[PDB]
Amino acid sequence: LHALLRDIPAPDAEAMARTQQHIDGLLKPPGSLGRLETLAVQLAGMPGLNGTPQVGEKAVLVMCADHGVWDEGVAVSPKIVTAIQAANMTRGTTGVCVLAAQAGAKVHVIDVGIDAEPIPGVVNMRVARGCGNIAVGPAMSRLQAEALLLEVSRYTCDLAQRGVTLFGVGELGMANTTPAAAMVSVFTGSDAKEVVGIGANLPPSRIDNKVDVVRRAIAINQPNPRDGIDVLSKVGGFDLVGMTGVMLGAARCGLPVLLDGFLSYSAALAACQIAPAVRPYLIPSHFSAEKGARIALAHLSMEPYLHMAMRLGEGSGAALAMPIVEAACAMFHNMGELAASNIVLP
Amino acid sequence: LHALLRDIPAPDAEAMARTQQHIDGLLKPPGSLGRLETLAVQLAGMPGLNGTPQVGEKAVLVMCADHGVWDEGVAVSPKIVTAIQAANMTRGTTGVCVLAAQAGAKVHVIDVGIDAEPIPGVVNMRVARGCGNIAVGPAMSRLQAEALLLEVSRYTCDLAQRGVTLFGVGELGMANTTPAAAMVSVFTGSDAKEVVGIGANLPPSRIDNKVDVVRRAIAINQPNPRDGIDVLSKVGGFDLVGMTGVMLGAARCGLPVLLDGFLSYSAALAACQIAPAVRPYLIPSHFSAEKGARIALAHLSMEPYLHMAMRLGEGSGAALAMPIVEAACAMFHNMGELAASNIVLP
Numbered sequence: 001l002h003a004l005l006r007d008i009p010a011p012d013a014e015a016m017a018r019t020q021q022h023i024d025g026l027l028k029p030p031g032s033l034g035r036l037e038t039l040a041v042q043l044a045g046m047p048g049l050n051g052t053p054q055v056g057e058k059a060v061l062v063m064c065a066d067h068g069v070w071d072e073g074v075a076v077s078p079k080i081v082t083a084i085q086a087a088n089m090t091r092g093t094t095g096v097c098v099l100a101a102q103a104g105a106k107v108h109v110i111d112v113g114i115d116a117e118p119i120p121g122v123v124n125m126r127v128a129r130g131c132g133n134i135a136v137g138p139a140m141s142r143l144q145a146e147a148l149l150l151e152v153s154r155y156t157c158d159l160a161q162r163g164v165t166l167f168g169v170g171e172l173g174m175a176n177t178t179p180a181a182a183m184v185s186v187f188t189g190s191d192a193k194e195v196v197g198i199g200a201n202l203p204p205s206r207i208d209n210k211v212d213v214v215r216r217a218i219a220i221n222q223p224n225p226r227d228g229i230d231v232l233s234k235v236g237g238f239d240l241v242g243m244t245g246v247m248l249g250a251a252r253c254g255l256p257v258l259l260d261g262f263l264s265y266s267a268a269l270a271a272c273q274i275a276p277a278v279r280p281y282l283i284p285s286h287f288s289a290e291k292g293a294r295i296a297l298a299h300l301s302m303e304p305y306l307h308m309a310m311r312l313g314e315g316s317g318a319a320l321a322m323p324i325v326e327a328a329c330a331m332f333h334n335m336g337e338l339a340a341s342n343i344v345l346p
Numbered sequence: 347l348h349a350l351l352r353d354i355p356a357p358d359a360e361a362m363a364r365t366q367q368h369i370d371g372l373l374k375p376p377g378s379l380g381r382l383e384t385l386a387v388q389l390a391g392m393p394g395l396n397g398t399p400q401v402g403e404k405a406v407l408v409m410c411a412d413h414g415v416w417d418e419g420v421a422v423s424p425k426i427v428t429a430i431q432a433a434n435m436t437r438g439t440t441g442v443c444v445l446a447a448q449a450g451a452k453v454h455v456i457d458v459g460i461d462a463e464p465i466p467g468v469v470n471m472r473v474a475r476g477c478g479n480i481a482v483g484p485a486m487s488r489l490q491a492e493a494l495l496l497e498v499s500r501y502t503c504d505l506a507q508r509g510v511t512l513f514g515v516g517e518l519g520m521a522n523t524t525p526a527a528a529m530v531s532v533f534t535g536s537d538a539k540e541v542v543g544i545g546a547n548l549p550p551s552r553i554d555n556k557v558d559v560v561r562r563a564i565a566i567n568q569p570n571p572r573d574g575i576d577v578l579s580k581v582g583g584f585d586l587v588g589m590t591g592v593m594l595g596a597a598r599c600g601l602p603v604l605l606d607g608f609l610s611y612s613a614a615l616a617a618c619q620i621a622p623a624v625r626p627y628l629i630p631s632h633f634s635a636e637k638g639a640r641i642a643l644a645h646l647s648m649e650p651y652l653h654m655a656m657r658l659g660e661g662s663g664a665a666l667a668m669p670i671v672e673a674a675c676a677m678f679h680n681m682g683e684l685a686a687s688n689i690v691l692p
């Protein structure tokens with residue numbers, strides 16, 4: 001794992017310079033395509049993309065797991081929904097499946113800790129039947145977190161060998177916006193009340209209890225903000241750890257990763273804390289309707305491309321933004337050039 | 347034309363109700379897909395879509411024309427760029443062509459007033475070789491505006507008969523952000539300084555002259571804010587009139603139209619002034635980096651889906667948002683249902 005983190009490559013400034021120069025000469029006023037240009041340059045700096053903005057195969061990895069904190073009344077969705085939905089993922093009837101198919105991406109459903117019998121068709125990496133209830137103790141041991149990080153990392157960079165050049169990250173787990181709020185609170189130094197939201201339609205009357213649970217989780221575990229792994233293991237969850245592992249794997253692989261919503265923001269804060277070198281590979285997708293979204297995004301210094309008021313999770317936002325990444329590539333490779341049309345601008 | 351405006355159908359509330367009910371029963375927490383759900387319902391209300399959110403063929407109509415106000419020094423791009431770029435449109439090397447191709451849409455380049463010889467391959471509807479310089483008089487006569495509105499309207503709804511169900515609108519014309527600013531200023535009652543931007547890289551030192559030109563155009567023509575056609579003919583342009591005509595045509599056809607950037611906002615303000623019934627058919631795409639964008643969008647009560655800091659024009663933003671419209675349709679038709687998985691939520 002220390003080896004892993006050590007070998008994450010820095011962006012290729014040489015390729016980025018050649019990219020910027022090429023974009024400036026395209027048939028349009030310089031910089032007129034805004035963030036599409038910036039995105040093309042960022043991609044060009046990713047070693048795994050071979051010095052140019054391109055997109056081969058696309059995959060969305062969905063990390064599924066249950067949470068012990070569900071028993072504290074922080075979620076109105078029945079617990080079995082995780083297992084049921086995970087099975088529906090294998091049938092392509094869920095939100096991510098439909099949006100991923102529309103984008104030409106393949107969905108990988110990974111069980112990292114669902115509290116139910118194993119589901120056929122689902123990649124099995126379960127650590128346990130749900131993580132511990134963060135309200136009275138840690139979600140898992142540091143060892144378990146480090147092991148899952150490593151496992152998911154290898155799985156991720158291994159897909160790279162099969163033609164995948166763009167990753168989308170997502171999750172599935174009833175009650176997970178609670179440990180995500182705790183994590184955000186700890187990494188950004190924000191108070192619980194400012195980052196706890198309604199998750200999957202939590203009644204406004206039950207928000208107070210959710211805020212109290214987050215505070216207790218922090219007070220009891222005393223997670224160290226300067227140690228992302230400590231934070232993930234104490235007040236995180238298997239699914240959040242797995243999302244973090246995808247980001248580390250793609251970064252080690254020198255490939256881009258599309259973030260999803262609020263849960264993904266949490267995992268990204270942890271990943272950047274564990275290894276700052278990961279940041280250049282992260283690409284925002286949409287702006288989650290979850291209350292603590294603005295704060296988490298500010299500490300990540302990211303501005304999402306899509307404002308859809310989405311809050312489903314599953315990696316649906318990630319899949320929705322994949323066409324945007326391909327648009328920057330098409331712009332870069334298919335537009336004509338100013339010089340060829342004899343156009344000279346000041 | 348009075349007939350045209352009179353026959354614009356109202357949205358089908360019955361189909362929208364059936365749509366909302368179906369969306370609520372899909373495999374996800376109710377409302378969790380945010381604006382994607384709202385978009386699906388809006389589409390379902392459009393009579394031309396046959397009571398359901400669907401997308402058949404897609405077209406982006408680009409209105410090209412030159413402006414007499416170019417001689418006032420409000421644009422740094424040479425005048426011939428309009429003619430040159432219009433020709434490049436027929437070769438698929440421009441920004442809209444590349445993004446439209448990526449979306450599976452066909453681009454229609456229409457000349458409504460380019461100051462040059464006719465360009466082969468371009469639909470010919472030229473009113474004249476450029477419109478009058480709005481700084482010293484009207485851009486065109488009311489008759490010419492009404493005639494082009496009608497012409498473009500018929501062309502638009504005629505494409506509907508050939509399988510087109512989704513339109514994107516765009517333009518091409520050096521100096522057009524000047525008449526667009528004048529229009530926005532007049533319709534929203536905002537001062538020139540608040541809505542004039544840098545257009546296609548206008549030097550910050552030349553902004554003052556541009557603001558003065560807009561004020562003079564308004565003072566001399568005295569356009570009536572309550573008469574959209576009066577406004578278009580006096581301080582607008584052929585290209586802006588044509589964009590307005592596409593919106594009226596699609597609305598009469600009961601079909602959706604995707605707006606583009608700042609120029610399209612101007613045309614949409616005019617269209618809504620001429621016929622309020624047009625509003626339900628308009629769909630925002632991106633948030634233009636032009637200074638007066640926020641004001642124009644506020645008066646239209648629209649919140650764009652994409653924040654890309656784009657300012658190219660051509661209908662490139664419209665094409666970039668087409669995948670989003672198809673995503674709402676895929677969501678609606680391909681996701682599974684809660685009841686089928688035995689999931690019961692409060």
Ligand SMILES: O=C(O)c1ccc[n+]([C@@H]2O[C@H](COP(=O)([O-])O)[C@@H](O)[C@H]2O)c1
Nearest residue numbers: 075173174175177199200261262288313
């Ligand atoms: O991705 C988001 O921004 C998001 C925001 C709110 C809720 N969710 C989803 O809903 C679940 C978490 O909600 P909850 O109330 O059980 O904490 C989980 O399975 C997520 O996929 C996801």
Ligand SMILES: O=C(O)c1ccc[n+]([C@@H]2O[C@H](COP(=O)([O-])O)[C@@H](O)[C@H]2O)c1
Nearest residue numbers: 421519520521523545546607608634659
């Ligand atoms: O669509 C926008 O928001 C947009 C914003 C700024 C500039 N433009 C494009 O640039 C041209 C207008 O810029 P200008 O400086 O000549 O007024 C015209 O051909 C448009 O297609 C377009």
Ligand SMILES: Cc1ccc(N)cc1C
Nearest residue numbers: 027028029423427546658
């Ligand atoms: C100069 C210029 C201005 C606008 C557009 N759409 C394209 C070009 C090349």
Ligand SMILES: Cc1ccc(N)cc1C
Nearest residue numbers: 077081200312373374375
């Ligand atoms: C209840 C619920 C919660 C989250 C998700 N992704 C899906 C469902 C069905």
